[PDB]
């Protein structure tokens, strides 16, 4: 288990994320998705 995912470092990161939310709508929501019909086809 990497350091970032365990003790205080995780707690602090989670707190930081709660109080400083990123624009997930543009950072992930604008990024292309595979078509749902493609999900079980070639990657």
């Amino acid at each position: 288990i990497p350091a970032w995912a365990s003790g205080n470092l995780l707690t602090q990161a989670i707190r930081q994320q709660y109080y400083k939310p990123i624009d997930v709508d543009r950072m992930y929501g604008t990024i292309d998705s595979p078509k749902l019909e493609e999900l079980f086809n070639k990657s």
């Binding site: 970032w4 995780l10 990161a13 989670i14 709660y18 939310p21 950072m27 992930y28 998705s33």
Partner: protein, 269 residues
């Protein structure tokens, strides 16, 4: 588009019979999330491809502070990956089991959050159909997060026929083989409120037939420790006739909810 190499894998969060969920950090923005990993071959062999497709379609289009967000998804040669909001306080059912029952403050807060999330769903003609503690996770400040949409349906026009959900939570209309609508979620909210406060569902019985009997008779027997306010709300949700059930707006406005809820909305970007 995303690939698995865009994420630092931290640790497993949970195990399923189709894949696993991991705590992950996407490298670009150092943003901590959960990755649900499903195996394409297992999904096909079990014949659940269209089932998973529906769950993804529904959840990926919902944006609410009390609904677990699906940020995006991707696939590779063998696996489908769902990028999910991480719920730092974990399973609600584990918390209920640890405490036995929740106090009025905790329960009322959860009920406000639930009613708000379900209202959002119903506004979009999505019916959840499986509200129970096991389908709920908890945010950083303990906020309810609807996490699973396994029995959910987008039902724009037709009433529904599918018996689904969980024994102790089934509404009378499902047991009786009637058509159902979004008001099934109202019933389940009532069962949930009771279980929160009591630690057992209201129609608990040793047999499926006796549980069914108790549900259709609405054989509700309140423990003496419950407040009048909580019994009022539960009673108004657990109505035999779907049209008589307290609307979700009614739950949010209920005096017991107003007096006891300590709901906090998460900061937004």
């Amino acid at each position: 588009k995303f690939t698995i190499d865009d994420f630092d894998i931290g640790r497993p969060l949970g195990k399923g019979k189709f894949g696993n969920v991991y705590l992950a950090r996407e490298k670009q923005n150092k943003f901590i999330m959960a990755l649900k990993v499903l195996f394409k071959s297992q999904l096909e062999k079990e014949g659940v491809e269209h089932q998973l497709r529906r769950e993804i379609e529904i959840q990926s289009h919902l944006r609410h502070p009390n609904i677990l967000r699906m940020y995006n998804y991707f696939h590779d040669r063998k696996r489908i990956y769902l990028m999910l909001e991480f719920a730092p306080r974990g399973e609600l059912y584990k918390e209920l089991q640890k405490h036995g029952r929740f106090d009025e403050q905790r329960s009322a807060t959860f009920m406000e959050e639930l009613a708000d999330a379900l209202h959002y769903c119903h506004e979009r003609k999505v019916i959840h159909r499986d509200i129970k503690p096991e389908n709920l996770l908890m945010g950083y400040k303990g906020e309810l997060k609807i996490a699973d949409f396994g029995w959910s349906v987008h039902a724009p026009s037709l009433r529904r026929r599918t018996m689904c959900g969980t024994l102790d939570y089934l509404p009378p209309e499902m047991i009786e083989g009637k058509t159902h609508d979004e008001k099934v979620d109202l019933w389940c909210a009532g069962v949930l409120c009771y279980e929160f406060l009591v630690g057992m569902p209201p129609f608990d019985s040793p047999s499926h037939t006796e549980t069914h009997r108790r549900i259709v008779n609405v054989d509700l027997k309140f423990p003496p420790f419950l407040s009048d306010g909580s019994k009022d709300l539960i009673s108004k949700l657990l109505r035999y006739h779907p049209p008589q059930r307290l609307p979700l707006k009614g739950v949010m406005e209920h005096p017991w909810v107003k007096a006891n809820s300590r709901r906090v909305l998460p900061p937004v970007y």
